[PDB]
Amino acid sequence: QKIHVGPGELDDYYGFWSGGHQGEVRVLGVPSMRELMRIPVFNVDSATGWGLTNESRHIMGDSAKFLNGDCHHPHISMTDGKYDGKYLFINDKANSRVARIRLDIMKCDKMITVPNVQAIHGLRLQKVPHTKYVFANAEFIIPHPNDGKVFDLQDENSYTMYNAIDAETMEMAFQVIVDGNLDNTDADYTGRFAAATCYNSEKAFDLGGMMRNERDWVVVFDIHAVEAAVKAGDFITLGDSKTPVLDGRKKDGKDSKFTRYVPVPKNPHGCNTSSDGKYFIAAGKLSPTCSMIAIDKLPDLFAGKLADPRDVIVGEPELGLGPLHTTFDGRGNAYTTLFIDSQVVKWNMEEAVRAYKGEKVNYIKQKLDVHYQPGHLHASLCETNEADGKWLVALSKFSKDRFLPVGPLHPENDQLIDISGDEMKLVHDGPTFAEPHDCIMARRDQIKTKKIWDRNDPFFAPTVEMAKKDGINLDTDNKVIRDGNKVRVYMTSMAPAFGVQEFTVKQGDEVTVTITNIDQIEDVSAGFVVVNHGVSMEISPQQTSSITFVADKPGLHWYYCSWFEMVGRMMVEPAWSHPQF
Amino acid sequence: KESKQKIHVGPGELDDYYGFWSGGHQGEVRVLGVPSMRELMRIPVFNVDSATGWGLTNESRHIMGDSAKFLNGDCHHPHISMTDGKYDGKYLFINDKANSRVARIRLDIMKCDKMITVPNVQAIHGLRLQKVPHTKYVFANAEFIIPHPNDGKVFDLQDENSYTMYNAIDAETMEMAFQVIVDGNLDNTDADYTGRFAAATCYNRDWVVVFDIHAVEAAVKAGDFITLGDSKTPVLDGRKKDGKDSKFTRYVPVPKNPHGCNTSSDGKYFIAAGKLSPTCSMIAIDKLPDLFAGKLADPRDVIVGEPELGLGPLHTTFDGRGNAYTTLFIDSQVVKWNMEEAVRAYKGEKVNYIKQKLDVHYQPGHLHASLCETNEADGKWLVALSKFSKDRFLPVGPLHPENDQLIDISGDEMKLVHDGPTFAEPHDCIMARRDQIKTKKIWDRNDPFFAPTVEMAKKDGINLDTDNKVIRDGNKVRVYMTSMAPAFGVQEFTVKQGDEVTVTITNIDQIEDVSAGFVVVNHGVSMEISPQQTSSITFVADKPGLHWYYCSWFCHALHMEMVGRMMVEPA
Ligand code: CUZ
Ligand code: CUA
Ligand SMILES: [Ca+2]
Ligand SMILES: [Cl-]
Ligand SMILES: [Cl-]
Ligand SMILES: [Cl-]
Ligand SMILES: [K+]
Ligand code: NA
Ligand code: NA
């Protein structure tokens, strides 16, 4: 299998990397592991203007006031258990958001702050019949209401919730109150069931408290039951949020209709659906095991056909110290990170099931040393029924001596591993910034990108509407609209000239500059920077972009095209020559 | 004779060089390993970095000063300080064209430690360092002509007081040293190997303006200068007046809208790339004393070569073996040529100085050979940074990566060996040998980077190395804590809604690589605390109720559980 991509050759896979606490999404070529693009999401990007432009701030909403995010879990939308290449979704643990990225333009196009929760961590997508819901865990228990009356996590109204977002509308669909908390989550291959690990069944705030119980659990959600209660109006609402809220807590040992709690040791972490749809596999973390939940036994479990929730466990292989996450080659093998032993362990799932029945059989096939302390791992197409068994990325948290020293802060080590054969082969050490936690690969032919914008693209349609109100045809017009102390500049751009090369305003005016790149050649992006005003943005071919700033300094102020004589001048008349307020 | 260096750095092997890439319009500096071309680290400078909290923390905002209000930068030209014409590994400097700044990066901690807004100018673009006897000055071009004063009375760019200026910054103090008014616009700049001369390409035939830095220093020492506005910076007038020269400058006619301005590693030439002219112009540095002394009949007499090379020459670099390498933007090539043969051709000899043209993909701007800015230029690696990558990488939407192409120059024939895609047009880069960079493994508790925070802690009676304390001061709350995986030293505290909370964390772990983080959920608060570092961040607790904070940097098996609670009592 070819590991090295030479000049003129192209990568075989796209890789979509979480940006970690840096807040972006990164597009890599696989197997070269080179970074092809950065997609700003929760970060403010000087280069494109994301977080500065009106289009981007409109998408972020009120959360545009935050300059940070913390992402972990990128996932690609699916149709019938296969990637359809439409959307990528990712979490923000820092400011409790989910974002949607459109894979045709490689931009974030939608963002939501999840109501009545703190810290969106675990995230994964419904697989079947398609990605109708984005499933997202809120990790931290909080009071409801959280108004400063009650701080006690043991209060009956202190809890966290499982969250379902409508993937197409990026509005909330429902939330389910759970016992304990929520770590990671995955969905089955039918649409009925989703599942999440919990590490804080104790509802504690201290370290020893969260570690007390020998078993926490994975909570299983009957999504069909949830939907039926919503359609029946059997729900409540919290605060000013209209989101339907269902109670999936146990009441005095009696289960709700919406959830079952399968005891799993111990502070379990990863929650991974095998690519054949047979299992939710929970990684034991503090227990040296994974627990294999038989999805085929879940209907009987919710129908009371089983005596003990543990009856849905059909395997619990002992694997090594600190199992965190599991992935799949599509050949029947699972691959699990061992954080403490610092390895990836390859094991056969059907043999583990047989060992759980007492059959003496060695289900462990290989242990590969990684460098060092691996967290997530990802095999190519592992989240689909097309899991191809070719590439594996293990994302390790301490790179130590594997790269040149660069000061007290080290890179992460994302190691590419060839799993096409019976023996795992470490082929490449990939240093990355700010701790990507996890990544997702797609075949080259699963992603179809636009090379030039459509003039009706929803990304800037609000700006087109604003322009229409000013009587502006954006494809042609080079005009300065004045409106009190507001100035709206509209111009076309075509290399190497701005359509408006100078304009004059009064000191203190609020200036909006809207630029429509009317070029039609690929790769010829333009930029716009106003010197010493903190203004910067990208305008690609046929895109309209706009940015608003206060002309707070009198005098002449240059603007220039960043993304390459293509310059202009803003002239600001001093306040003392104009009416005084 | 052959170019046959190994390019593969396999698992467990280390790169041979550091590469320092400009972050382009994204505003950071990036550390790469060469020849693997992998990005080892991002150093935030003019960008706001969610990961480390640069732009959010009190330490970073103190370094940025008032310019902390800007969330953008536009970087181009990274350079490493020198002693006796060789890299000394102390500092890296870089420009900000967008908000007119220069930043200094300390190469032992790989952080920006100083930043200056250059007064009375717009857009710092070209930038290079004094070489000899060391980098006493950072030389920086302000690109755009503006009125002086720029107070809104005069907008006329032809006015006698409309001009731009060449800027000298004291590398060690990061304060302005002096500014020189010039005729025309400044493009790129470089310095000689004595400390006496610097040069910059100019567009108003245009010119290369040469600065006699010794003459400038003498005028400053004598008090023969003016100041502009409210800046104390000495300002000298390097313009021609009624055709008569300043003592500070000479204008050497050079075709045509010349762009790159590069000092050859043997110290013989300032080489200006011709752009609109399919040539480079070679200025003999050893004729400059005669030029300034009035012993030459014509400023053109310092030109000793003008080789014809191809369409669109933009920048030049050196292998230390006598060859120059120049980017041809239109022809989309690197052309390797012999400088002494070009000089003889200029005198009329029949000699072909062109050695090879290598196709690059596509439209190269800057290029950089390893150690090319030093008298130790080693002729091993070349990076050409091309603007239009077209079909050289997988498609990724309407925006495309820059193509930074690694070229083996160790032998007679240039060999293209790697295409490296990069984000936001890095534009230019610089390389250093592995052994020229020495980095700290853990922070020093006396480090100036957070010394102002240590001072604040001292005013509160706090021993940062041990204390876990909450200081109440009106509506201000100052939390001080130690951190040691997997526990914050203060795991809960209570404030009043509206309070201004400062959280100062000292990571007292001693193990390399065990960094800690701090994030306050739904408050826009995030920062890094590496081993032995103190970091602080200020935010207002504007929301009543229980608000979680957690460690963002995976540091331990129990990392998910390294958390705390801020309790905010309602108004
Ligand atoms: Cu957020 S956790 Cu194992 Cu996913 Cu990294
Ligand atoms: Cu300390 Cu994560
Ligand atoms: Ca527990
Ligand atoms: Cl998981
Ligand atoms: Cl140059
Ligand atoms: Cl040679
Ligand atoms: K790390
Ligand atoms: Na929204
Ligand atoms: Na400063």
Ligand SMILES: [Zn+2]
């Ligand atoms: Zn440049």
Ligand SMILES: [Zn+2]
């Ligand atoms: Zn250039």
